[PDB]
């Protein structure tokens, strides 16, 4: 527990202790009022007065305790802010230094390099899979003759009611720009 | 020299934030204080109400002075390029720079950063100019601000007029001093 | 004590740094997102998305 | 520079590059004035 958190806890406790003290005065002021009534009925006017003074003294003590409780709470609410924004400020100071380290050892130039390399190596691994796929295609060339695939596609297209010819092979802005390149 | 442009820039920002809080706080404390004047008037304690009003007039003038210094700080921030560019004082900054130097020893109790702002301006320009500012031998400090941070007691006709208007707002009977109201 | 070892000038500095470093980490994610976009350019043709 | 660095971490405004009572000065003036 931080040294301010110890103070915060003590202030919050003191605010409650005062609030309890005010409630206890309300309880006892109600009790003394009952004793005035009894003393008046018995004609004990000296005792009636003693209880009257108690009742008025606890009525007013309550208000004092209640007002101090309010003040100590307001303070505690403000020390709470300091405790919280302390923690937030220290966390953000931590973030700033750990990001400062990482942005040194991986600067944007080094990231640019890494990204370009990443992309170029995946271009390679695409050239590689292409030539594996063409090695398998030619190795198994007798197992899948072209004409049998073309005829099966046409048969399945006929059953699907699709007019697209499967034996035969199967935008404008690109063509416009192409013409421009040649025309200049 | 000892002049550091980023010290001046950081502290000008801090001064603005602090003055913006003090304006708000002192405006709210005047609301609370004007009710206290009405309480003295209700109690018929008019001679003390006069002296308590002088406190309110001084804090009201102070808030108006803070609004002027917050404007001159924001002007130096707006034209901060000229400060760090030239070695001569630009004529558009003369009022702002001289005023901030003049005000600093008055306000430095409340606005600690304004001490630092004046130190930096007295580093950028000459220490000699820094003396001509503090005495307004430089003949350039803003007059309306010098009036508002004067140490003299308010005109007694202003005190009466304050009481009259506070009396109206809180619906409290007040009769002003005829000897003073004759000077209107 | 705390307002000495973290004064407002030192806080101003820290805050400016904090902001500038997050501007950097946004330039960084932008160029990672453009590296992935161009690396996978054949998997998402523009006309098929449109 | 090390003193300034340690002063910055301590939150102390005292400049460490630069160099860092009245009765004595009064009496000094008296000695010269006579």
Assign 3-class secondary structure to chain C: CHHHHCCHHHHHHHHHHHHHHHHHHHHHHHHHHHHHHHHCCCCCCHHHHC
* Chain C residues whose beta carbon lies within 8 Å of the beta carbon of residue B5: none
Is C7 in the D-facing interface, judged by CB distances under 8 Å?
Answer: yes
A-contacting chains (≥3 CB pairs under 8 Å)? C
Conformational region of residue B27, where left means phi above 0, alpha means psi within -120 to 50, and beta covers everything else: alpha
Length of chain A: 184
How distant is the Cα of C46 from the closest Cα of chain B, in angstroms?
47
Contact B60, B30 (CB under 8 A): yes
Cβ count within 10 A of residue B72 = 22
Q: Where are the alpha helices (DSSP H) in B79-93?
A: 80-85
Neighbours of B62 (CB within 10 A): 18
Q: Which residue has the tokens 């950097």?
A: C24
DSSP sequence for D1-34: -HHHHHHHHHT----SSS---HHHHHHHHHHHH-
C13 in B contact zone (CB under 8 Å):
yes
- A 10 A CB-CB count for B7 gives 16
Given a contact cutoff of 8 angstroms between Cβ atoms, the answer to whether A122 and C42 are in contact is no
Q: Test C31 with A92 for CB contact under 8 angstroms.
A: no
Long-range pairs for A116-125: beta carbons < 8 A, 24 or more residues apart:
A116/C35, A118/C35, A118/C39, A119/C35, A119/C38, A119/C39, A122/C39
Find, among A120, A121, A98, A117, the residue nearest to A109 by Cα.
A117
Alpha carbon A112 to chain centroid, angstroms: 30
Question: Is residue A21 within 8 Å of residue A66, measured between CB atoms?
Answer: no
Termini Cα distance of chain B: 53
Whether B58 and chain C come into contact, CB under 8 Å, resolves to no
- DSSP state for residue A171 in the 8-state scheme: -
Reported in sequence order, the residue ranges of B53-173 that DSSP labels E, i.e. its strands, are none
Phi then psi for A44, rounded to 5 degrees?
A: -80, 70
Asked if chain A contacts chain D via 3 or more Cβ pairs within 8 Å, the reply is: no
Q: Is B4 in a helix, a strand, or coil?
A: coil
Cα A154 from Cα A170, distance rounded (Å): 13
- Residue for token pair 């007059």: B143
Among partner residues A96, A119, A171, which is closest to C18 by beta-carbon distance? Answer: A96
d(CA A13, CA B165): 45
| Residues B9 and B79 sit within 8 Å (Cβ to Cβ) | no
**Residue in A82, A63, A84, A65 with CA at minimum distance from that of residue A16:** A65
Closest CA to A22 of A64, A52, A75: A64
Q: A118 and chain C: CB distance < 8 Å anywhere? A: yes
CB-CB under 8 Å, C39 with A122: yes
Cβ contact D–C (≥3 pairs, < 8 Å): yes
Would you give the distance in Å from CA B79 to the centre of its chain? Answer: 23
**CA-CA distance, A122 to C37, in Å (whole number)?**
13
Strands (E), chain A: none
Determine how many CB atoms are found less than 10 A away from the CB of residue A147. 8
Tokens 């004793």 sit on residue:
A35
Structure tokens given for C8: 């407002």
In 3D space, the residue among C15, D11, C28 whose CA is nearest the CA of residue A95 turns out to be C15
CA distance A52 to A35: 9
Residues of C in contact with B12 (CB under 8 A): none
Those residues with Cβ within 8 angstroms of residue A69's Cβ, 6 or more apart along the chain or in another chain: A15, A16, A18, A19, A21, A22
Give me the sign of the Cα torsion angle B11, B14, B18, B19: positive
3-state secondary structure A11-40: HHHHHHHHHHHHHHHHHHHHHHHHHHHHHH
Residue of B nearest to C16 (CA): B10
Experimental technique used? cryo-EM
Name every residue whose Cβ is closer than 8 Å to that of residue B105 and which is 6 or more positions away in sequence: B118, B134
Question: CB of B62 within 8 A of CB of B149?
Answer: yes
Q: Which residues of D touch C7 (CB under 8 A)?
A: 11
Strand, coil or helix: B112 = coil
* Residue A95 tokens, joined: 């973030």
What resolution, expressed in A, was reported for this entry?
Answer: 3.0
Cα–Cα distance between A119 and C6 in angstroms, integer?
Answer: 45
Nearest to B148 by CA among B37, B59, B82: B59
As a whole number of angstroms, the distance between CA B108 and CA B7 comes to 17
CA distances from A131 to A124, A134, A137 (A): 11, 5, 10
CA distances from B109 to B103, B106, C4, C8 (A): 11, 7, 18, 17
Contact A39, A51 (CB under 8 A): yes
Buried b (16+ CB within 10 A) or exposed e, A19-30: bebbeebeebbe
Q: Could you tell me if B172 and B49 are in contact, meaning their C-beta atoms sit under 8 angstroms apart?
A: no
By three-state DSSP, how is residue B86 classified? coil
d(CA B77, CA B142): 18
Nearest-angstrom CA–CA distance, A33 and A10? 35
Q: Which residue, among B149, B148, B152, B145, has the nearest Cα to B98 in the 3D structure?
A: B145
Residues 28-47 of C with CB under 8 A from B: none
C35: distance to nearest CA of chain A, Å? 6
Cβ atoms within 10 A of the Cβ of A127, count?
8
**Nearest Cα to Cα of residue B176 among B151, B153, B155, B159:** B159
Any chains having at least 3 CB pairs less than 8 A from chain D are C
- Cβ contact B56:B30 at 8 Å: yes
Helix or strand (DSSP H, E) at A76? helix A45-105
Based on the number of CB atoms within 10 Å of its own CB, is C12 exposed (0-12), middle (13-18) or buried (19 or more)?
middle
Distance in angstroms (rounded) separating the CA atoms of residues A66 and A19? 6
By C-alpha distance, the chain C residue nearest B14 is C8
């Amino acid at each position: 527990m931080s040294n301010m958190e110890k103070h915060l806890f003590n202030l919050k406790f003191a605010a409650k202790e005062l609030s309890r003290s005010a409630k206890k005065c309300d309880k006892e002021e109600k009790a003394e009022k009952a004793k005035i009534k009894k003393a008046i009925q018995k004609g004990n006017m000296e005792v009636a007065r003693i209880h009257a003074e108690n009742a008025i003294r606890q009525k007013n003590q309550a208000v004092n305790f209640l007002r101090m409780s309010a003040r100590v709470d307001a303070v505690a609410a403000r020390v709470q802010t300091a405790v919280t924004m302390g923690k937030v400020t220290k966390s953000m100071a931590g973030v700033v230094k750990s990001m400062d380290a990482t942005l040194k050892t991986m600067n944007l130039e080094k990231i640019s390099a890494l990204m370009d390399k990443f992309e170029h190596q995946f271009e390679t691994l695409d050239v590689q899979t292409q030539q594996m796929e063409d090695t398998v295609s030619s190795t198994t060339t007798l197992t899948t003759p072209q004409n049998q695939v073309d005829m099966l596609l046409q048969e399945m297209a006929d059953e699907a009611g699709l007019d697209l010819n499967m034996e035969l092979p199967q935008d404008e802005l690109s063509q416009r720009l192409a013409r421009l390149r040649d025309q200049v | 020299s000892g002049f550091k442009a980023e010290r001046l820039r950081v502290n000008l920002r801090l001064v603005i934030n602090r003055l913006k809080l003090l304006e708000k706080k002192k405006t709210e404390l005047a609301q609370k204080a004007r009710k206290e004047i009405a309480d003295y008037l209700a109690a018929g304690k008019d001679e003390r109400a006069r002296i308590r009003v002088e406190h309110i007039i001084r804090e009201d003038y102070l808030v108006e002075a803070m609004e002027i210094l917050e404007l001159y700080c924001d002007l130096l921030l707006a034209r901060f390029g000229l400060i760090q560019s030239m070695k001569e004082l630009d004529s558009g900054l003369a009022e702002s720079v001289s005023t901030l130097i003049w005000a600093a020893p008055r306000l430095q109790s409340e606005v600690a950063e304004l001490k630092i702002v004046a130190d930096q301006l007295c580093a950028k320009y000459s220490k000699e100019y820094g003396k001509l500012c503090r005495t307004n031998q430089i003949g350039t400090v803003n007059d309306r601000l010098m009036h508002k941070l004067s140490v003299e007691a308010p005109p007694k006709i202003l005190v009466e007029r304050y009481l009259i208007e506070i009396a109206k707002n809180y619906n409290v009977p007040y009769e002003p001093d005829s000897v003073v109201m004759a000077e209107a």
